[model samples]
Target chain A: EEVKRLIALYELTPHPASGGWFRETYRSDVQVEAEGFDGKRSVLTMIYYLMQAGQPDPFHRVKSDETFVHNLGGSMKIHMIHPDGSYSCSILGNPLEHPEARHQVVVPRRVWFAQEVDGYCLASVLVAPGFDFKDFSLGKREELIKEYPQHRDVIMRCTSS
Target chain B: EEVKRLIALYELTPHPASGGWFRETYRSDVQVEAEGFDGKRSVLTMIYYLMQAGQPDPFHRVKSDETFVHNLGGSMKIHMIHPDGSYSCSILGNPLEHPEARHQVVVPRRVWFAQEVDGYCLASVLVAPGFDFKDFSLGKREELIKEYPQHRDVIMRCTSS
Candidate 1:
C-alpha cells in the first residue's frame, strides 16, 4: 500500500535500465565542459529510486560519479566491483541497527554495481556531471562473468542482462 | 532515544553555521575547474544532515547548487530567497501525505535558504561544485532584511546572524 502510494505520488515510471520504480527529480542548469563526453554536461542531476524485494538486479556502470542516500525502508545492499576488480558491499540504512550501514554511500565512476532491498525501499541518487546515456553501460552477464570469474556467485545472482 | 540513535549512527557533529547535526559522508575524487573559486573543486560532495524542532535557523547562501533529499521524519520546510529577491518555500516530504511536498528539492546557486523540521528529521544534501567554506556565506539578519524588505517576515523568521 505504501509502495503504491509513493508510485502514484511521484508519478514514478519503471526504470528501463534497472528494474525499479523511479522519477527524475532535478536536473541543474549549471553546465561544465568535461571529459568522456562530446558536449557540456549539467553540473548535477537527481532521481528518487524505489526498489522492492526480488527485483531484477542487473549490474551496470556509469561514467559520472554517484551518491546514494537512504530515504526509507529498512536497509539496502549495494554490491560494487571496482575497476581494479576489488569488491565491496555497502549497506545503505541506519547504522544503529546495522553497524556497517552508511546513511549516504558514494559510488565511484566506472564501478560495476548491483543492489538488493529487503522490502519497499525509497532512496535518492545524486549524479555529478549529470547523467547521459552516452556514458552509461548496462553490463552483459556473460561478458562480465568472463572478466571477473572469481566473483561468479555474486555476478550470477545480480546479472540478468 | 530516537534522536540520539541517529546522531550516534551517523557520527554527526554539531553544525555551527546552521545549528543542526551533520556529517560529511562522501567527497568525490574527480575534480573540475569551476567558476567562483580560486582552486579546482571535486565534482561532487554529500552529507547526512539531521535536525529536530526549534533548531537555529540561519539564512545562508552557497555558491554551488544544492539538492535536498528527504530521508526520514514527517516533513521539513526549506525557505528560499532567489537572487532577484523572490521568495519561495518548498516542503520536503512524502507527496502522498502533502500535495505540495517534494521528495527531492533543488536550490540553485546564490539562493539564500533556511530550514525547519517538526520531529526528528534525517536528510541528505548533494552539493555540486563540491562545498567549500570559501564559497559559503552566512547572512547577517540586518543586511538581508534591508536587501529584501518585502520578505522581512520570512527573513526575520529564519535569520539570526
Candidate 2:
C-alpha cells in the first residue's frame, strides 16, 4: 500500500536502462568547482530508487560519489567493483542484521556497482558535485565480464547492456 | 516492521526541539554562495526523519530552502506560515488522495512551517546550501501569536519555545 502510494506520488517510472523505477527529487540550480566538470553543473542531486523482487539495478557508475539511503522495505545487496581490481558487497537494510548493514552507504566515484532488492526496497541516491547523463556510464556485460572475469556470473546476472 | 527497521538502520535520534527522530544521511563537502551564509557551509545536506502518532514537529523556520521528500508510511500535513502574513497547508502523502500531494515539496527560505504525522511517516529532508544550527530558528510563541493573531491556536499548539 505504501509502495503504491510512493509510486503514484513520486511519479516513479521504470528506469530506461536498469530495472525498477526512479524519479529525481532534487537538483541544485547552482554550480560548484570540481575536477573534469565544466564548472556549470548542479552542486548536488537526489533521486528515489524503488525496486521489488526480480527487479535488480544494472551495473553502472557515476563520476561523483553516490550515497545511498535505505528508506523502506527489504534489504538490498549492493555490489561494488573498485578501480584497484577489488570487489566488495554491502547490505543496505536493517542495522540489526550486521555491523556492515547500514542505512547509509557511499559508492565511490567511478566504481562499478549494481543492486539486488529482496522483496521490495526504496532508497534515495544522493550525488555530490551533482549528476549528469554525461557523467553516468552503464556497464556493458561483455566488457565488465572481460575485466572482472571471476565475477562474470554476477555481472551477467545484473547487467542488461 | 519496516518502519522499525528504518529507525534502527538509520540510527535516528530524538530531534532536540522537534518531536520526531532524525539522522543526518549526507553532507556535501563543497560550499555554495548564499546571501546570509558565511560562504563556508556545505553545498547540500540530507537527513532522514521519522514521526509517529502524537509526534508533531514543532513550528520552525530555516534560513535556506529545505525540500522534504516523502519516502514511506503515513501521509504528513505541513502547515506553512508564510512571511507575507499568509497561511497555507500542504499534504505530503499519497497522490491518489489529493492532486496537491507530492513526493517532494520545498519550504522556501525564512518560511515558518511545522509538520504533523498521521499514524506514522518516514521522510527525507534535503537542504540546499547546507544546514547549520545557526541557520535554524524555532518559532517563539507569544511573538508569533501577536503577529498572526488568526493562527493563535495553531501557533500555541506547534510552539513550545
Candidate 3:
C-alpha cells in the first residue's frame, strides 16, 4: 500500500531506462542558454525516482548533471563510474543509521551510475537542464566492463542478467 | 539520539535565521549570469534542513528561488505567502499516511514561508542562485501583519513572542 500510494500520488510509471518507477514533478518555465545544448532547454527539471529492493537499476548516463536527494523509505547505494574511469559508491539514506550515508550527491554528465536499494527507496533527482530522454544512455554490461575493468565486480553486481 | 546523529552527520548548526538545525551540503562550482544578481552566483546550492516540534519555524523570505524535498522523518507543513500576498500550505511528507502530502514543492523569491512539524522532520532545500545569508530576511510579526491583514493568525502562530 505504501508503494501503491506513492505511485498514485506522483502517477509514477515504469522508468524507460532503469525499469524502476519515476515521475517528472517539476519543469521550469524559463529556458537556459548553455554552450553545448541546442534549441530550447528548461533551466531546471526535477523528478521523483523510486527503486525497489530487487528491481533493476542498471548503470546509466545522462548528458545533464543530476543532483540527488534521498527521501523516505530504505537507504540505497549509488554506484558511480566517473568520466576518469574511477569508481565510488555513495550511500543515500539517513546517516543516523548508516555510517557511510550521504544526504545529497551530484553526478556529473557522462558518469555511468547504478543503484542498489536495501528495501524500497524513494528519492528525488534534479537535472540542471530540463530532463529529456535524448540525453539518457543505458550501459551494456559487457561494454561497461570493457571500459572499466577495475570496477568489474561492481559492474557485474549492478547490471542484471 | 536520532537528532543527535543527524546533527553530527551533516554537522548541522542552528539556522542563523530560523533557529532550526541546517547545513549547507551542496554548492555548484559553475556560476550563472542572472539579470538582477550583482556578482558571482553559483548555478545551484543545497542544504539539509531539520525541524522539530514546538520550535521556531517562523516565516522568512529569500532573494532566490528554492525547491524543497521531503526526506526522512515525519511530515511537516510549509506555509507560503506569495508575492501577491496569497497564502498556501504545502505538506511535505509520505503520501501513504498523509492525504495532503507532497513529495516536492518550489518556493519562489519574495515568498515568505514558515514550517510546522508533527514529530521531527528532515528535509532538503535547493536554491537556484547558490544560497547566501545576505539574501535571507526574517519576518517581523507586526510588520507582516501590517502588510497582510488577512493572515494575522498564521503570522502570529509562526512568529515568536
* Best prediction by lDDT: 1
Off by over 4 Å in 3: A156-161
Q: Which candidate number would show the highest DockQ if scored against the true structure?
A: 1
Question: On residues B6-78, what C-alpha lDDT tens digit does candidate 3 reach at each position?
Answer: 8876889997667589877767656566666677677677888999888758988887778988877888888
For model 2 the local lDDT of residue A69 reads 70
DockQ for each of the predicted structures, in order? 0.68, 0.30, 0.50
Residue pairs whose backbone atoms clash in candidate 2: none
Clashing pairs in 1: none
Tell me the whole-model lDDT of each prediction, alpha carbons only. 0.83, 0.79, 0.80
Q: Write the per-residue lDDT of candidate 1 for residues A69-158, one digit (tens) a residue.
A: 877777899999998889998888877666777667878888998998887778888788899888889888899889999899999888
Ranked by DockQ from best down, the candidates are 1, 3, 2
TM-score of each: 0.91, 0.80, 0.89
The digit string of per-residue lDDT tens for model 2 on B1-161 reads 77677766667898898889898877775655655666577867878889887867888888777777666677899999998899998888656555667656677778999989768888878777788888888888888998899999888778785
Give me the iRMSD of candidate 1, please: 1.7
Clashing pairs in 3: none
lDDT of 1 by residue, B1-161 (tens): 78787787668999887778988878877678876678988888888888888874688888887888887777898898888878888889877666788778888788988988887678888798898888888899899878899988887778764
- When only the first chain is scored, the TM-scores of the models are 0.95, 0.92, 0.90
iRMS, all models: 1.7, 2.8, 1.8
